[PDB]
Amino acid sequence: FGVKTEQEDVLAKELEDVNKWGLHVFRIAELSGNRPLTVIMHTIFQERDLLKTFKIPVDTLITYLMTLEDHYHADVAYHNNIHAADVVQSTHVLLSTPALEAVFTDLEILAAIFASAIHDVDHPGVSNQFLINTNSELALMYNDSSVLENHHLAVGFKLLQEENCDIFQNLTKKQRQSLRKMVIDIVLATDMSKHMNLLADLKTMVETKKVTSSGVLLLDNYSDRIQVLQNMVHCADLSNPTKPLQLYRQWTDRIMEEFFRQGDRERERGMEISPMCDKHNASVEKSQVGFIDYIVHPLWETWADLVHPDAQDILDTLEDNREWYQSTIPQ
Ligand SMILES: O=c1c2cccnc2n(-c2cccc([N+](=O)[O-])c2)c(=O)n1Cc1ccncc1
Numbered sequence: 190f191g192v193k194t195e196q197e198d199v200l201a202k203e204l205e206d207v208n209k210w211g212l213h214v215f216r217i218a219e220l221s222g223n224r225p226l227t228v229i230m231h232t233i234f235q236e237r238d239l240l241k242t243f244k245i246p247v248d249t250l251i252t253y254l255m256t257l258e259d260h261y262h263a264d265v266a267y268h269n270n271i272h273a274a275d276v277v278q279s280t281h282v283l284l285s286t287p288a289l290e291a292v293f294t295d296l297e298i299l300a301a302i303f304a305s306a307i308h309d310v311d312h313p314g315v316s317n318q319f320l321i322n323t324n325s326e327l328a329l330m331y332n333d334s335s336v337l338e339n340h341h342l343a344v345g346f347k348l349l350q351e352e353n354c355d356i357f358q359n360l361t362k363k364q365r366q367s368l369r370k371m372v373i374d375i376v377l378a379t380d381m382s383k384h385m386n387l388l389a390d391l392k393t394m395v396e397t398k399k400v401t402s403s404g405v406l407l408l409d410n411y412s413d414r415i416q417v418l419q420n421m422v423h424c425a426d427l428s429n430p431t432k433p434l435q436l437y438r439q440w441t442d443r444i445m446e447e448f449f450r451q452g453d454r455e456r457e458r459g460m461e462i463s464p465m466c467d468k469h470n471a472s473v474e475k476s477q478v479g480f481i482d483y484i485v486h487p488l489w490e491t492w493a494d495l496v497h498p499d500a501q502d503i504l505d506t507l508e509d510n511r512e513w514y515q516s517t518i519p520q
Pocket residue numbers: 381426427428429430437440441442444445465475476477479480481
């Protein structure tokens with residue numbers, strides 16, 4: 190016809206909030222026919238002019254994106270395509286913070302967004318330790334070391350080889366080598382076993398924080414640049430408690446569903462039930478307050494310092510949600 194369907198128009202209107210924290214990502218998932226990752230990535234690529242800059246054919250991008258999304262598991266409650274789309278969109282917002290204006294190149298931006306899109310692809314909904322303890326083929330391949338995170342990368346890159354999926358076909362070898370290194374460095378840093386070290390180095394960076402009069406951040410070497418990009422995507426990955434409570438509670442329900450399912454599998458197998466995975470011995474409210482106090486608030490407070498005052502509202506929202514859960518603990 191040449192004109193959008195009414196569902197497509199309603200989807201387009203929702204996507205006008207692509208640059209805002211708290212996008213209605215679950216509504217977009219529904220309106221797009223469970224294509225949140227494809228539609229959100231396409232919108233962001235168009236907005237940042239990445240198709241023109243990197244000479245990506247539009248049909249190749251849509252084909253690759255649909256293929257990537259298809260390799261997230263629809264049966265997995267949390268680590269699915271909706272989570273991927275959320276992490277992409279959250280990274281997209283963080284990249285555009287005033288404190289980071291003109292800091293990153295288009296290739297570095299491409300790296301952060303692509304890494305976000307692929308960072309949990311083909312997740313089975315169980316932890317690295319579950320895969321290790323069962324002597325899974327994946328664990329054997331990857332020597333029990335960042336098993337899932339290595340796999341997410343291998344799959345994200347492998348899918349480029351499917352029919353009309355090589356979205357990097359026009360990049361030079363130099364551009365591809367740089368992009369690849371950045372993407373690998375970012376996704377391997379999403380392993381939660383790397384969190385404390387990652388946070389340690391972010392703190393040190395804030396301690397030595399340098400800024401150019403009219404104060405955008407100053408980053409002079411790859412180590413500093415990649416460190417900020419790694420922590421940015423890690424912040425996006427751990428951004429659920431910083432969103433409006435209506436969104437945050439949906440994510441909590443999903444991750445508890447996934448965790449309890451793993452616990453049920455551990456129980457039926459005679460394995461010890463992993464932390465937070467026992468549906469018969471859970472303290473959801475207590476656990477969220479602990480999660481925030483020990484992991485999420487320390488990370489985000491440090492990020493907020495790096496980009497001060499850009500992240501004040503995000504940090505305020507986190508603190509409100511923390512107090513809500515705290516007030517909800519049965520004594
Ligand atoms: O993003 C969230 C997450 C997001 C929303 C709600 N809860 C989350 N929790 C969570 C769940 C139960 C208990 C605790 N705890 O610290 O005691 C944390 C989590 O660990 N992450 C990070 C994470 C996500 C996926 N796999 C492992 C860790």
